[PDB]
Amino acid sequence: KGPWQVAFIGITTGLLSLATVTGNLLVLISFKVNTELKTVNNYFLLSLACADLIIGTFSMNLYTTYLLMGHWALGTLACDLWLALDYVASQASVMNLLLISFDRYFSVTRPLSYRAKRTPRRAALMIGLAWLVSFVLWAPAILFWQYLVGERTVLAGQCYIQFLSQPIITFGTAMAAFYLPVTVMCTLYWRIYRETENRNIFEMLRIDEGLRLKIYKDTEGYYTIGIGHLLTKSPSLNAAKSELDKAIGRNTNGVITKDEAEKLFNQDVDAAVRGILRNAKLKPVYDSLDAVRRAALINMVFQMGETGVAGFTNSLRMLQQKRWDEAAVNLAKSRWYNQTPNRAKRVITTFRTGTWDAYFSLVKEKKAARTLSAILLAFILTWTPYNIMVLVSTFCKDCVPETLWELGYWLCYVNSTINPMCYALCNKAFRDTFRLLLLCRWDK
């Protein structure tokens, strides 16, 4: 390695090092000192920032130094500790990506039952166990394989992992550790892309119809449970409970769980849409509408039934003609509007605007999606060349050159610099605490 080369690489990866340390350390201190940031969401980013911090302060610098000098000078035990720390931290980063992806998936697909158990305790337990499984997966074999085999194979002055002898070995580990997590993450991500609409429908109908896990008597008097699930119009409090037990599958005794309310809601809403597509009057307009207004009409069918909604003849035609304001005014003439005005006005605003403004704002959530997509894409592109190089090195011996190995190994470190720069700068509270910390002027 030439002197100019050494100076350039050392300076640049130095800068990248202190940028990683500064960023992730700022996440840690901001979380510690600002209670507004002490959210379960930020538990995960704190753990990620611990991994990226470890990588930023030890890994990039020891690896860049050993690569520039050409030999390892800190000894065998320091070598083993460095590789153990690097692989444990990196596998931890992957594991936290998986944990975030699953957390988001369950938050969208089980918006009621999962959100009820997203407690700081459970978050801390699963973060800690992600780190535990990373450590168990990498540290024992990196440090003690030499004593178990009986001799240390790695040359004096050099530093690498002994048990990754064969390229097929390291490619199997690359599948378990990288490829399968990446595929699971992507399949999730897409699944959330295809489920946000159903969650918005669920939350809309929970706002309008309410949620009770104990049976109550509705407007007309009949017995209902869950999110507006009517059991039976009979007057017998146990004629209701028998149909409840038949609907869930256990002796309900009148009380259900929130995931049973989610199951009951899914059966109800699927029945609503399936019926809509069976009804000759509602199918044309439902087909003509976008997703949000489709949700408004699903709302009306949930409240009044298909015959009752089909009774809105002229307003439904105005909906088919995209005459939103005239349809709003016309639906305001209805007894429906005069009997449940607060819900009817929300539904009407949904028809008029085609947005969720009458029910909820999704700005912060959409930006959180942008942040997560940025993080995972940075991960994929900075980590993919190395694992592709493993994949190739299994089929062919020594195709990929040593320079390429060095660069692809070094590139996996960069997403540790990128991760805090995603949520931190464009997310408020983080930005403001970063500012007041870098100013040394934080007094609560």
Partner: peptide
């Protein structure tokens, strides 16, 4: 889980 956060 953001969704409910204020702007």
């Amino acid at each position: 889980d953001y969704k409910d956060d204020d702007d």
